[PDB]
């Protein structure tokens, strides 16, 4: 955990964030012309980057977003497939692991059912070690079909990782499960549209703290036609501190070495913000000294997390009531989106 | 959610939160006569704030911390009792409602278990109409009995309030529960030492934001002969920018003015970021364009919520491995904590 | 006034501005192409934010500047004319107010007087309801003609606007005028340069602040052959709080939804900084204490306001008094400005 | 215009702002007693910074706020009185002026009227060479006569001073008024309570940068029964940039040089944001290059001032119907203040 | 380096510093009282921090600032001393190092020649393991002797440490004659009375960085009847990036946790920003690929330093020519020193 | 010392940096092709900025970063040359001095020797000043060959002028050496990739203030295809205050005005943070009051200054034990770098 160097060391991995570019395309072509642009950046971030291990690009950084439900369907990638073999390529060519985004990845189904929004995480030897669909979708305006399952998967010199898409993150839920299933680095790659730009950069960090955990968002820049990309990519401590941070240039990387004995050490020997242990033994100083047992209580008190998973219909119900019960609102209308 | 003016209106509550001065106290006496400080601070506050309808004290703010067990034990409070009653004048005197820490509440088996740290809402007419014992209590220093239970109250004008204390709040859980239950504003009560500052406020803010809630905070300032306190209470909008927070003074004071119109509009018309909303509904989009309902899913899709419902045990142990075994480390050996 | 959603409500408006990257172009029909370029990214960006209601440019974005006083004549406009019937067409189609950029403007007695330096207000009918032109010029490079008078409209949801350019900004007695005349929010439309970058950051906030009116700017981004523009555009609460703001990029967008019954409330209920109120009531608890009215007082105190309107020309030598005589200096002389 | 030494030199004045912390006093022995507190604070203050010419304290820091109207009258002062002889030996001593906040000046007509609040400038010989009664109290709360008038006067060194006090900065206009009657250091002197903070230190800074003149603040600390104070006491150059600033610690000090010919030789030679001189002179290179004269415009083309001066009563008129008709509110009521 | 946690591993070191009020007192019996303050401080932080090896307190923080030459002699301490003892004495009861501030240390000559300003190291056996004298005084107020040698000394579990006192940091040499010893953290107590907040405050961040070192820096707080001081005591990473900072508050305490690897390992390891290493083995790739062999160049190429090294007076003289020939300037004289 | 203005006076140095878009070059035609550009660049701005007298460009800005060895020969320059001739006539049109980057410039030896990274400063008119070769090339990635010597010229209006190159700057000793030798203003050119953003913009304020110097940062932007560079040219006081600072945008300038004679009256007259001065008198007041003449200290009582002048080779031995004993390391191994 430690910014400023282009090295990295036997305890270290290298890990270089992208503020790429939202590419604006519509044919299979571009893609595969763009797959290969993302391929050169890598080999040639390479050579001034020695240390990095991991690099990684924005969500939609492959396709751009496909506004146009035929282009959608026409460009929606097979995983493995040409785009993947594009980008193992040049994770073997510069000897680096790598996280790229296909938007979209065809359904099972396809073409009958929407696309997956997926993220894949390629190894040095140019292998796919995971692959994450996203669980929550952009809704109303983005209409990929939403995945079911988070991963931990062993990366560059042993460290966990776990992939995130842009929205996903705004839900702490989800890197708490990234966190408990293992995770030492989640990954958020994101095509963040202003507005919420300082929220998102405060999530990112608060994400990091309240997790023990390191992370690393690659988030795209300019404009594309429909949106503008913020950018500010960045790399934070487990401490919620940031690492190093891009402004909101076009093709702007970060780059910093996180520490594999660091966070071992510390989510072994840290008390008092070990956030992942201490949830799961709550009051233990207070049972010892009452009597009961050395440790704690581990039971869920939330009456929320309790409801939703044993009758998630009662806790969307109960959701309504607070918010809405249509998905759309006619106070601002969206086509397609009911109210 | 406006900030600068000391007046509120129909649609707002005005909120003060003070960053009170830790007391260093040893009896009964003490804390008696401290607790008239408070409420003769109250009193004044309102003279100068015609708006103020609700105010916040930190917590261990009307006992300090008793370090000392046996001091304790002879200053832990009954609820209702002395000490609420003082407040109870004081917030009928000034016509508002206000937050109160009482620190130990005497357990049910007193003195025999340890007490709980609990908080009291107290109405303008002097009725306490909500208390709140606190979940995850700051071990491994701090020895008090674990609550079991979040509540959510109506407030002033109707804003729905749910309390919680110190270390709860580095849970996103427990924000999540409270906002879920329907709550419009959290107050989060501490005394909250150095060193963790930048990572308190930042994780305010992003938890106001990420549960689309008002957020108040109220923390200790000084130095009580053991901790120093960093103050910084603060009010936040629902959409995570903070109205106003104090630096580290003593008895410094905000005032904000939260609507109640604001935040029913936004939790009823927001889209992109309505974050209770979408939780409970994901893929909406997608599903619709897939001929597959339009409700998108409920279901909760992470694992470690799943078992930790179930079994709270594996959960405990899973966690274990990826931290430690026992609830103290040899590394750092503290008198009572096994290692 | 709230940040970070794509939507608005009956009681908001979305607004949205532009770090529009300047032009660089030298004829008619080069001006007609990227009036063309505009209006397609009104339509895109309408896709993505359902919410917008007014979308607003930067000071220059239809032209870029014009330094050639040739060039400067040949394109100037008729308002209406073609580049207006562009935009005009773009916010029928994206149902959306606009405000766009003439420089120049044809002088009533073109080309024999240099053109004006003026904005539009167009409708979400595509009928123009605003034109102001620049009341004070950026003296001493930029040549326009002066205008002499503040406007205030019915904008959308009957928000009330008014439009300022740029240098007017610097002045605070613009935005008082505005603000009195009973703007509810000023829209100030810049071509903003290097060097002042801080200073104009902070002086919307403070001028949104002072007078209790919401605030949005949009400033060109970009280096144009001459100056570099800084982009920030911003959109900032009546209580001096940013919504959001953008950073240096080109072509950056902000969005954020502004309270219309906010902003009534708080002018009708605030009291310690409702500063419109005041500055005409002054001394009101004193005078009723003494016996004296319940009014305060309204008298103009200041003796500049007195003689500038009595006597401008008076106040034009005092002032030269503390400055210089002549508009030029001969330590940094400048062709066709006199020292 | 330099910061980080304890020295001054022939060319620029060494300005200390004080932090001073709010008494709470009750009769007028206490009011001596506190008055020669400061008097040795100055003299102390001398020892560490031989630099110093110009000291500076907050609005009430004499008196602290007499919130009892018997009190009030009872500590009112004369000036001259005991209290300025007090503080006049002290910058003898010192060799040293000085800026004192008397709160009550007893009224003309006392104890049958409210006293004003008053601000007085002493010089190093021991003189009152400024009386300054402020001109808009912080109403409702506070009950000071209003004054009516600013002044200029020549200070240390020959730098010409206006003084202001708390509220009255909030308004554009008095710091117009004192630039245009040839000010160069405003300094505002204020017993500024929370909330309002961070909009009051940015409204100083935009005020030192929109009037070309160098700025200092001395803000109030502490807790005085009432209302909390936040500090951040600061010197501003005229270029908008702080000099220093403090945080909210009580007794804080601040100091920083201002030199003389700096902002003689800006408000001579700056042309594109010599604000002072630009706004007398509007489009003077569009009238020089359409045949006009050399001296741009002068006339005030602000309707609001216009008015303002002509039939004060009708911009009250005007003002009260996009605010409110009467001074109180019925939605926030305040005894005495009528709605 | 990590942050947040009053833990500490095998691997970190515990570091408190403390934002200790300073002391204005007269005698030597309240010397050793305060003396016993900070004693009793020290054992009671212990109890909230486990992980605490290592307190820090400012300069003065035992006698505060004697400015009285008689009170200055009369106080000043013998080390080893009773002072030193009361605080060996807390070091052992804590089984904690710290560092101390002896204000002033007699002089060899006693009471002949001025004392020393003096920072000793204690360990947790309670020896005093380092001695240093302030080698650049705060002139010119300050009428201390100047000391002449750097040190570094084995500390907690190993760590390298140097201490420096307040103005000697503002001297980069200095940090940079440190690590070259193999420093590993540098401790910077100060009494560092504002204006220079904002440059101290950046100037153990950049010094950080510069040297590729551990800083902890102790500041005083409160005011003492001559000088305010401005906190920020702060432990900040060897990468220059931050800890944890306190603010303005009186005994303010920050707590930060610094790895003994993570140096090492860096110090090996880094490249691109390997200060200590890079500076004596410059332009080492251009060398090899001109093949004029393998190990840069050592040679000093600053004449600056080649002139002070071997004719000092030179370098005096030389510098005279830029500033000035007498310690004392006319246009602010100081009592006994020439101009 | 002053931001805002695009003017300058008889005391004002008015100096302009360009955030320069990192060229990708790779032809002599395409080096002389973008020289032009770059003479274009300072023909235009000047017409936006009358009163530049200074204009800076960043490293490499001319050549790009020739990443290819036999490209670096074949593109290397001739000083003076075709390049410098096209930058000088730009200064003459202009009337402007400027500082311009040569990357490679031929060795003595070309081309047997590594080039050297030289800067110029070419006069208004047009003669080349000043030629500095860079004295810490960047290794390990960069294979210039180093150069031995700083220099101070007159500049504009007798402002004396260094100039260092990127890595440099990141040794303290060279700021030093600059301002001992009597530089009012260090020019610091860069091609500064990312990580190291905040540290680079701290370091450069945190010189101005150490030496009591103007600085000037050019820094390039955009990416490569190898580096992404962050921009952020800056302007800064000899206080160490920025003036102003660009972000990270492409083709951005920022504009300030630094005084003559404030950093001579400075200089001159400071006395607490005089740095220049008391680092070759320390301890003044001290032996003063000790009877020991009234100079201060001169001589160096830094053993590693001693060292390294007497012995550069036990000053490389004695890092090495601390750092590594080879210029490369095993752990992240570059190809021609040995470990
Ligand atoms: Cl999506
Ligand atoms: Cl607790
Ligand atoms: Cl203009
Ligand atoms: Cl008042
Ligand atoms: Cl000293
Ligand atoms: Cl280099």
């Not at 929407?114 to 669980?135: D, F, H, S, W």
């Not at 520490?259 to 207070?286: E, M, P, V």
């Not at 009662?314 to 759309?328: D, F, L, W």
């Amino acid at each position: 955990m430690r910014h400023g160097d282009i090295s990295s060391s036997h305890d270290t991995v290298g890990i270089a964030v992208v503020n790429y570019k939202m590419p604006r395309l519509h044919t299979k072509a571009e893609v595969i012309e763009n797959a290969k642009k993302i391929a050169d950046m890598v080999v040639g971030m390479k050579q001034g980057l020695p240390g990095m291990d991991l690099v990684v690009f924005p969500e939609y950084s492959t396709m751009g977003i496909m506004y146009d439900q035929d282009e959608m369907f026409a460009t929606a990638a097979s995983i493995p497939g040409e785009e993947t073999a594009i980008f193992a390529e040049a994770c073997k060519k510069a000897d680096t692991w790598g996280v790229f985004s296909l938007t979209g990845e065809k359904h099972e189904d396809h073409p009958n059912k929407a696309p997956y929004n997926t993220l894949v995480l390629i190894n040095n030897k140019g292998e796919i070690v995971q692959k994450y669909r996203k669980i929550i979708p952009w809704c109303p305006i983005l209409g990929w079909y939403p995945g079911d399952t988070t991963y931990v998967t062993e990366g560059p010199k042993g460290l966990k990782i776990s992939l995130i898409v842009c929205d996903d993150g705004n839900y702490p839920e989800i890197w708490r499960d990234c966190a408990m299933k293992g995770a030492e680095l989640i990954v958020r790659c994101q095509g963040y549209m202003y507005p919420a730009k300082e929220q998102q950069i405060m999530m990112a960090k608060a994400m990091a703290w309240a997790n023990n955990t390191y992370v690393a968002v690659a988030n795209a820049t300019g404009f594309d036609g429909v949106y503008s990309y913020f950018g500010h990519s960045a790399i934070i401590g487990f401490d919620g501190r940031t690492l190093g941070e891009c402004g909101t240039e076009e093709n702007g990387i970060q780059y910093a070495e996180v520490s594999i004995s660091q966070i071992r050490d510390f989510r072994k020997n840290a008390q008092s913000q070990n956030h992942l242990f201490k949830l799961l033994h709550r009051g233990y100083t207070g049972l010892i000294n009452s009597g009961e047992g050395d440790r704690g209580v581990a039971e869920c008190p939330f009456d929320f997390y309790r409801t939703w998973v044993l009758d998630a219909e009662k806790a969307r119900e109960n959701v309504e009531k607070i918010t809405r019960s249509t998905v759309g609102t006619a106070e601002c209308p969206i086509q397609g989106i009911p109210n």
